[PDB]
A paper describes a structure:
MK catalyzes the fourth step in the MVA pathway, the transfer of the ATP γ-phosphoryl onto (R)-MVA to give (R)-MVA 5-phosphate. The enzyme is, along with galactokinase (GK), homoserine kinase (HSK), MK and PMK, a founding member of the GHMP kinase superfamily. LmMK exhibits the characteristic GHMP kinase fold consisting of two domains. High-resolution crystal structures of LmMK are reported and provide, for the first time, insight into the binding of substrate by any MK.
Recombinant LmMK and a selenomethionine (SeMet) derivative produced ordered, isomorphous monoclinic crystals and a single-wavelength anomalous dispersion (SAD) experiment provided initial phase information to solve the structure. Although the non-hydrolysable ATP analogue adenosine 5'-(β,γ-imido) triphosphate (AMPPNP) and (R/S)-MVA were included in crystallization solutions there was no indication of ordered ligand binding. Such a low value is consistent with results from gel filtration and ultracentrifugation experiments that indicate LmMK is a monomer in solution. Molecule A of LmMK binds the substrate and overlays on the apo-enzyme molecule A with an r.m.s.d. of 0.7 Å for all atoms.
Residue numbers in the entry: 1 to 326
Amino acid sequence: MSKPVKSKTTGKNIGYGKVILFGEHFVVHGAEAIVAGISEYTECRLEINPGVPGLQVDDQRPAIPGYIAQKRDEQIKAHQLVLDHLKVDLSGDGLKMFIGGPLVPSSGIGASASDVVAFSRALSELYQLNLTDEEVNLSAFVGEGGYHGTPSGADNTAATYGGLILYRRQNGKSVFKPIAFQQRLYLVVVGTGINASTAKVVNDVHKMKQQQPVQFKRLYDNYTHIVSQAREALQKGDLQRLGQLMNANHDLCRQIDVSCRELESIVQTCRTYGALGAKLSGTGRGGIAVALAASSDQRDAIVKGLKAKCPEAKFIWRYTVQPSAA
């Protein structure tokens, strides 16, 4: 068992949020996906709790209403998975856990991964485990097993590493590599307030493929062209084109029946107010959408326009993706 070396963490142990820029659903069928680990993060602080067994959680994240209550049981399992994985024993002296950071937990933003990532990092600090990024990512992956199934890996990987990430099922598992990019991405992410079941939607997509092998294959190849071009746009630093491609991607998502009225309303208003591109992000049929802005100022216009004109935009967040290099 790991014995605690420090009495209190003093570092900044965080896990980044996540949005899928390209390729939700199509990735299941072998397409490349672009996932963005955002700057906005969840932080975990730990200290010893002498004489008091177990893990005391003081969850102060700015989560949407009801989110923390509704995820608590899964969180309990998630945290215990990480403790067991890291060989941490809280049966004598326990730990007080404070959870913070500016990330807003809500369906679609990868918050559960940000949680287990931040936790793994703080444990590494307190127990002086010197976890590598790979080791943290695995710990997060194990812990993500405590939230409702199933982890592909993209959420923990974005939360651990941040930045842009190429995500594909290769050769027969999830494969991830970083994407070099020299420009800030100014994002508006919007929550619908509607919860979707990944497993259920993904299986609906499988069924459509079984019912329409030739049509599906058409949409799938249509996708592969967009992502190819998206990679180009990024290497060039061409954000207008990147935005147009996001629009094209949303269009394809509508054609596999994973959008909804609320998502459509949001994306229409984002484009109206000058988004370079806008699309559902992740599972669809609820959850979040993401818009790309050309600057911080034009983001102010999109947020203003959503608030005045789109009642379906229940929660509006300004998030950013950091450039990998100068």
